[PDB]
Design a protein around this ligand. Structure first.
Ligand SMILES: CCCCCCCCCCCCCCCCCC(=O)OC[C@H](COP(=O)([O-])OCC[N+](C)(C)C)OC(=O)CCCCCCCCCCCCCCCCC
Ligand SMILES: CCCCCCCCCCCCCCCCCC(=O)OC[C@H](COP(=O)([O-])OCC[N+](C)(C)C)OC(=O)CCCCCCCCCCCCCCCCC
Ligand SMILES: CCCCCCCCCCCCCCCCCC(=O)OC[C@H](COP(=O)([O-])OCC[N+](C)(C)C)OC(=O)CCCCCCCCCCCCCCCCC
Ligand SMILES: CCCCCCCCCCCCCCCCCC(=O)OC[C@H](COP(=O)(O)OCCN)OC(=O)CCCCCCCCCCCCCCCCC
Ligand SMILES: CCCCCCCCCCCCCCCCCC(=O)OC[C@H](COP(=O)(O)OCCN)OC(=O)CCCCCCCCCCCCCCCCC
Ligand SMILES: CCCCCCCCCCCCCCCCCC(=O)OC[C@H](COP(=O)(O)OCCN)OC(=O)CCCCCCCCCCCCCCCCC
Ligand SMILES: CCCCCCCCCCCCCCCCCC(=O)OC[C@H](COP(=O)(O)OCCN)OC(=O)CCCCCCCCCCCCCCCCC
Ligand code: SF4
Lengths: 175, 311, 41, 70, 105, 110, 98, 80, 156
């Protein structure tokens, strides 16, 4: 059960996009994309990609999806919902989320194990710890090489970010 | 055995947050020439327990919520991110010893504005939504200088490891080569938690009951104690004997208490900023100095041949 | 060619521009004073 | 007077002292009277699993010295 | 329009990230360094049309090093036969695959 | 593994405290109350300044995302190139800040 | 091909189908577009960490930064639409039929 | 160029401090003698294995044992 | 019995927690707000009783009507009273909030705030001294102390 955990997260990841590709609201759309970002980050972190998972949290979720929720909250005029005493205002939430985990556990059925067991990855998929690397994360040093090897990449990226600042300030003027 | 360690982290956090209210009211009492609470318990030691039992049986306001799910998930996220910021903190050895604990804490604190934003949209008020948007803009503003100051200090560390930050400061405190980063870091952590003189929420989560307000309240104070401990580890790092870890634990405890009382002593001393005045403080005062000191702490270990070890 | 679905389509403006308030708060009694604020941001 | 704030500060200081003392004692309890092995890197984990294999009881913290070689 | 400025002027703007067998930091190998090196040294300079049909063995070794589809197929076959024999009761697992043998070093 | 157990315990304690904070005063049969702020029925006007400071956060946060591997890039052999590109990124962050300055972008939240 | 890569591709195509059937809002379009960007980040990261190809580890961050800047541009466009009509509705964006 | 400097130090000391710190951060790594030692320490830090060479017969600069005279030595790093 | 003892001890617990943690929402209507400010000033010092200074109305426990209630503000008084969570309490401070006071026969004055809100403690004086307002607060705490909520729950 514990072996297939990345695969399990990937299934949840797929289900997470069905949370918001059906598009119930842009606000619940942002909420589903935040949950999907967290579980895809779990997929990244379970291959030893620690810095890239923390870039998912720090830059994608805490950097950009904050701005998406911020711009969404400056639009789409709100309206109240059901606000009866606690047999509705939290009990329906708990029964709905228990049905959501019921849906998560419900898809691991006989139509799934014909794909899981015929194409068993866990046992031979996650091979990032194949031998020794040394005193360094290879992924950390590969990201560190952006400054010595990636001179042109850093030039065009910083130029695109400066042009991004200029472009946003020109189009958001109205004059 | 590990679950025992998680409980012995998280239960004393909640007890320390409970008695921080007593320490705040007593220290703000004596600084305002008055006394703080002394009637309820002996010298006030039952005032947090009485306040907690009062807030946890107070009537829910029957809130006209714009959403159920964000109304529930804002205190849940607030408490979860209040607790999970503590697990890489080296005291002198953390609960979760990870190689990127600094970046982990920066990420989990950058995720902490969703509790504000979801509390704001989960209210029906447009005024509460405007206050929440102002608070979110303030917090993500000061997260910029959190990240740049933190990067500039860790150019002397070698890596994002918090336990390595104890090894870095065994000869000198890191406030000596980095005191402008220290003072701007301290004002930036003051402005993260919406703490005075940056508390324009008392100048967004009032849609909640008194119980969920106590949850946001205790998450805010856990963030206050946590950022004081993180500043203590980051600039005033204590001596560590590996055969007696209680020397380091008592030393950073005393320094963390002094820095938390320094928050309590700042809030009883200054008027509040106007909102554009603290946006002026960030974007026009702290950010040029912070970028210049980032350039300085990049280029300075290269010119002094003091580049810290990677491992 | 004006068909059935295209007959109500008016031509666009000649210079290609199209013809397009501020907030009012009530700081109530929540001394005491009520403040009606025409605010502009 | 001013020393009246000291019982609350003392209680809060004990509440901050308990987690660090607790995790230091648990690390010495679960690792043979010593510190927990820090494996931030692949070499540290490789030596750690080599210790776990040479100890024979699936525990890295049982150190086999010169008595295990002839 | 492929204006090869990087070969005209003699600059290295993006050749270093292109293949796995290039100069990596701290001489880290890729997982398929030998297979990609052999596909590149086989298919070098002869053009794509000859490279598709005259270096297919090295290219399939490198593709199978990348995806490991034949190796996962073989391991699924052996594990399926092992599961069927454990289910039939005609086979017993060894002690060195059950966890009672006090591993090598 | 220990991290997932710790996150799960923190999430369980958070959900438990929220559940106690909602269900414990709903034992009370206090009163069903009626008759439902600085606006009564006003819509939300948009503010351009809040969106400008949000996008300014996002662009400088991307520049910080580039600046993050510097404590690892200090360990490299090509220190002249590394120092030039580090100073170039922080200088471009400063040029973005100066352009945000002079075009009145930092005004009325300065 | 492989399994978890097929899952990340399935998420990419699901957010593509959400990006190709608009319901009401432009923010829903930008969210489906950034879910596509997220799935590209995840799949690129798993490939680059799988092969131990070291220099490409800076590539997903690059794939983040530009595209996040791209999202910023999209948000600003939405804002100007919401400054003309009051809503971000895609059916207000139909003046270019003639 | 001096009265303007006193004026900007009077009005805006934050930007004067920022441009001074940034200017020193630019110029001082080249005006320093200790900058080369950063390069030398980062290229003498052994992250990999020092793979030995087959002795063809004529290599005077390559030692046979780590405790030999010839070879790159770090006496300067131990002493400084 | 046993359950009578359990509900009596839990009544003592919740009454202790509610009376030792009263949070006031003071209506600063008139001159009595000055003497409430003196009751929060260091000499009398409400904060050492657990009575915090200027709590927000959506979490406060006791409404102190300190000053003259006029006809233009009585709906705002009842609105802020309706926005208070239970158990809410009303302390009426001074003669104009008690019964109209010096403006009793005025065309514009509500003759007592107990025409608007249910009032628990009547604090007399013009203004009552801050020591007397503190006496009224402690008498409110003793009124909360002798409540019998779980006892009457167990007996109904
Ligand atoms: C880590 C432990 C704690 C660390 C120390 C912090 C504890 C002390 C806290 C005290 C109470 C703080 C209360 C709230 C403060 C908020 C207000 C405030 O102070 O705002 C910041 C104020 C803001 O100033 P201001 O608001 O007055 O400025 C007005 C600005 N105009 C004119 C544009 C309107 O100051 C700063 O921003 C300075 C930050 C620190 C600068 C450090 C510079 C170091 C020296 C550099 C070199 C200079 C010389 C040139 C080169 C020479 C080379 C030889
Ligand atoms: C660790 C942090 C703090 C944790 C929380 C504090 C610990 C104690 C928690 C329980 C406190 C007591 C129960 C909640 C308060 C009840 C107050 C109240 O009004 O009760 C009357 C209420 C209702 O009384 P009622 O029937 O008179 O209704 C009053 C409303 N009218 C008249 C309008 C209909 O009693 C209950 O609902 C019973 C609650 C449980 C009683 C005790 C059972 C055992 C509990 C263990
Ligand atoms: C404006 C651009 C300012 C920076 C220019 C590059 C500075 C630099 O480090 O160059 C050396 C670097 C790399 O040289 P190097 O000295 O690092 O070489 C050592 C070899 N490696 C990289 C394998 C460790 O770049 C070049 O030589 C060519 C790339 C830059 C070409 C010019 C780009 C201009 C863009 C204008 C828009
Ligand atoms: C609204 C929903 C509910 C809201 C409240 C709850 C969610 C939000 C608050 C909690 C956030 C969870 C964050 C989880 C990951 C944190 C980052 C991380 O794992 O960093 C630590 C570490 C990297 O450090 P390193 O030392 O390199 O690793 C060991 C190498 N020897 O890496 C490791 O140690 C890796 C450990 C294994 C991987 C852990 C995966 C966790 C499960 C997937 C994500 C779960 C959350 C999904 C939803 C998020 C919504 C924001
Ligand atoms: C890490 C540090 C954490 C520290 C946390 C605790 C801080 C406070 C430390 C103790 C302070 C004093 C506590 C006692 C206060 C006074 C209680 C008391 O005696 O009240 C008297 C009351 C009336 O009873 P009666 O008999 O009528 O009296 C008339 C005289 N014959 O009778 C009663 O009220 C009934 C008896 C009630 C007794 C309650 C005592 C306090 C309970 C605290 C619980 C938590 C303690 C810590 C737990 C974790 C550590 C072990
Ligand atoms: C007016 C033309 C000015 C041309 C100035 C010199 C530019 C130059 O060096 O062009 C090189 C190019 C031939 O380069 P080549 O390698 O053949 O290009 C591969 C195409 N994919 O030369 C050409 O393509 C020559 C024709 C260019 C015509 C451009 C305007 C039409
Ligand atoms: C080359 C080294 C690297 C340089 C790049 C990195 C710098 C790090 C800091 C980045 C700062 C980014 C933002 C800078 C904006 C500059 C323009 C500016 O602020 O002009 C307006 C200002 C007048 O002030 P005012 O408009 O009133 O301010 C509003 C509040 N009252 O005008 C002023 O206050 C005048 C500001 C410009 C002149 C400052 C001169 C400082 C000189 C220090 C000593 C010499 C340093 C050597 C380098 C030369 C620098 C000019
Ligand atoms: S009772 Fe008298 S002194 Fe008090 S507020 Fe009224 S008018 Fe002023």
């Amino acid at each position: 059960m514990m072996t297939y955990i990345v695969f399990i997260l990937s299934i949840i990841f797929v289900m997470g996009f069905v949370g918001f590709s059906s598009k119930p609201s842009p606000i619940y759309g942002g909420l589903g994309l935040i949950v999907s970002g967290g579980v895809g980050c779990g997929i990244v972190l379970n291959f030893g990609g620690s810095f890239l998972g923390l870039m998912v949290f720090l830059i994608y979720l805490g950097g950009m999806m904050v701005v998406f929720g911020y711009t969404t909250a400056m639009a789409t005029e709100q309206y109240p919902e059901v606000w009866v005493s606690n047999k509705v205002v939290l009990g329906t939430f708990i029964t709905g989320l228990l049905m959501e985990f019921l849906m998560v556990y419900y898809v691991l059925k006989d139509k799934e194990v014909e794909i899981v067991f015929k194409f068993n990855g866990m046992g031979d998929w996650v091979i990032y710890d194949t031998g020794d690397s040394g005193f360094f994360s290879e992924e950390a040093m590969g990201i560190a090489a952006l400054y010595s090897y990636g001179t042109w990449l850093v030039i065009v990226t910083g130029w695109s970010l400066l042009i991004g600042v200029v472009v946003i300030m020109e189009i958001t003027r109205g004059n | 055995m590990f679950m025992i360690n998680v409980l012995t982290l998280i239960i004393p956090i909640l007890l320390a947050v409970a008695f921080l209210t007593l320490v705040e009211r007593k220290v703000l009492g004596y600084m305002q020439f008055r006394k703080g609470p002394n009637v309820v318990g002996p010298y006030g030691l039952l005032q947090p327990i009485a306040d907690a039992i009062k807030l946890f049986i107070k009537e829910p306001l029957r809130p006209a919520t714009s959403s159920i799910s964000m109304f529930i998930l804002a205190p849940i996220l607030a408490l979860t991110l209040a607790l999970t910021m503590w697990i890489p903190l080296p005291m002198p050895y953390p609960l979760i010893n990870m190689n990127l604990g600094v970046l982990f804490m920066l990420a989990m604190s950058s995720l902490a504005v969703y509790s504000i934003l979801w509390s704001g949209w989960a209210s029906n008020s447009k005024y509460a939504l405007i206050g929440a948007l102002r608070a979110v803009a303030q917090t993500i503003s000061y997260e910029v200088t959190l990240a740049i100051i933190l990067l500039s200090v860790l150019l002397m560390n070698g890596s994002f490891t918090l336990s390595t930050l104890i090894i870095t400061q065994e000869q000198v405190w890191l406030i000596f080569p980095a005191w402008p980063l220290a003072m701007m870091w301290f004002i930036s952590t003051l402005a993260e938690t919406n703490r005075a003189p940056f508390d324009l929420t008392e100048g967004f989560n009032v849609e909640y009951a008194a119980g969920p307000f106590a949850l946001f309240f205790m998450a805010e104070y856990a963030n206050i104690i946590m950022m004081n401990i993180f500043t203590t580890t980051l600039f005033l790092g204590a001596f560590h004997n590996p055969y007696m870890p209680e020397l380091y634990t008592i030393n950073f405890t005393i320094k963390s208490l002094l820095l938390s009382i320094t928050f309590l002593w700042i809030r009883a001393s200054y008027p509040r900023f106007r909102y554009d005045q603290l946006m002026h403080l960030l974007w026009k005062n702290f950010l040029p100095l912070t970028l210049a000191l980032c350039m300085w702490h990049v280029s300075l270990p290269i010119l002094l041949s003091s580049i810290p070890p990677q491992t | 060619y004006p068909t059935k679905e295209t007959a109500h389509w008016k031509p666009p403006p000649w210079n290609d521009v199209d013809p397009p308030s501020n907030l009012t708060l009530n700081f109530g009694p929540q001394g005491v004073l009520r403040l009606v604020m025409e605010l502009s941001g | 007077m001013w020393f009246e704030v000291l019982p609350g500060i003392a209680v809060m200081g004990v509440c901050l002292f308990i987690p660090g003392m607790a995790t230091a004692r648990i690390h010495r309890f679960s690792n043979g009277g010593r510190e927990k092995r820090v494996a931030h890197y692949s070499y540290q984990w490789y030596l750690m699993e080599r210790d776990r294999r040479v100890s024979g009881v699936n525990r890295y913290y049982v150190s086999k010295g010169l008595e295990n070689i002839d | 329009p492929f204006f090869d400025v990087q070969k005209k002027l003699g600059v290295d703007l993006d050749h270093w990230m292109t293949i796995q067998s290039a100069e990596q930091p701290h001489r880290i190998p890729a997982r398929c360094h030998a297979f990609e090196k052999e596909w590149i040294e086989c298919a070098h300079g002869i053009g794509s049309i000859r490279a598709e049909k005259e270096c297919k063995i090295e290219f399939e070794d490198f593709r199978e090093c990348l995806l490991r589809q034949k190796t996962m197929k073989r391991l699924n076959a052996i594990k399926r036969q092992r599961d069927k024999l454990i289910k039939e009761g005609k086979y017993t697992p060894p002690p060195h695959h059950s966890g009672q043998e006090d591993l090598r070093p | 593994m220990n991290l997932m157990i710790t996150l799960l315990t923190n999430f369980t304690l958070a959900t438990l405290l929220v559940t106690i904070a909602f269900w414990l005063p709903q034992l009370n049969v206090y009163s069903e109350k009626t008759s439902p702020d600085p606006m009564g029925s006003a819509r939300l006007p948009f503010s351009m300044k809040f969106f400008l400071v949000a996008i300014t956060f996002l662009l400088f946060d991307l520049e910080i995302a580039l600046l993050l591997p510097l404590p690892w890039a200090s360990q490299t052999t090509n220190l002249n190139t590394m120092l030039t590109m580090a100073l170039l990124l922080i200088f471009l962050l400063a040029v973005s800040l100066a352009y945000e300055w002079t075009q009145k972008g930092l005004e009325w939240t300065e | 091909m492989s399994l978890v890569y097929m899952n990340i591709m399935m998420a990419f195509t699901v957010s593509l189908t959400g990006l190709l059937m608009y319901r009401s809002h432009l923010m829903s379009s930008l969210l489906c577009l950034e879910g596509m960007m997220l799935s590209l980040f995840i799949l690129a990261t798993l490939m680059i960490l799988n092969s131990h190809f070291t220099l490409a580890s800076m590539m997903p961050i690059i794939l983040l930064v530009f595209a996040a800047c791209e999202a910023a541009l999209g948000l600003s466009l939405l804002v100007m639409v919401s400054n003309t009509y009051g809503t971000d509705y895609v059916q207000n964006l139909n003046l270019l039929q003639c | 160029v001096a009265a303007f400097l006193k004026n900007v130090w009077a009005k805006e000391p934050v930007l004067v401090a920022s441009f001074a710190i940034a200017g020193l951060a630019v110029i001082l790594p080249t005006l320093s003698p200790y900058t080369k030692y950063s390069l030398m320490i980062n290229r003498a830090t052994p992250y990999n294995y020092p793979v030995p060479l087959r002795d063809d017969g004529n290599m005077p600069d390559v030692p046979s044992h780590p405790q030999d005279p010839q070879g790159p030595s770090l006496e300067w790093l131990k002493r400084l | 019995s046993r359950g009578e003892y359990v509900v009596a001890k839990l009544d003592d617990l919740i009454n202790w927690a509610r009376r030792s943690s009263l949070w006031p929402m003071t209506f600063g209507l008139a001159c009595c707000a000055v003497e409430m400010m003196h009751m929060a000033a260091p000499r009398y010092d409400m904060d050492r009783f657990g009575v915090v200074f200027r709590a927000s109305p959506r979490q406060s426990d006791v409404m102190i009507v300190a000053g003259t209630l006029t006809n233009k503000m009585a709906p705002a008084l009842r609105k802020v009273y309706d926005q208070m969570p239970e158990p809410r309490y009303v302390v009426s401070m001074g003669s104009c909030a008690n019964g109209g006071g010096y403006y009793h026969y005025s065309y514009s004055v509500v003759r007592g705030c107990d025409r608007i809100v249910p009032v628990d403690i009547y604090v007399p004086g013009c203004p009552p001294t801050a020591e007397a307002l503190l006496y009224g607060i402690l008498q409110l705490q003793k009124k909360i102390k002798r409540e019998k909520r779980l006892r009457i729950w167990y007996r109904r």
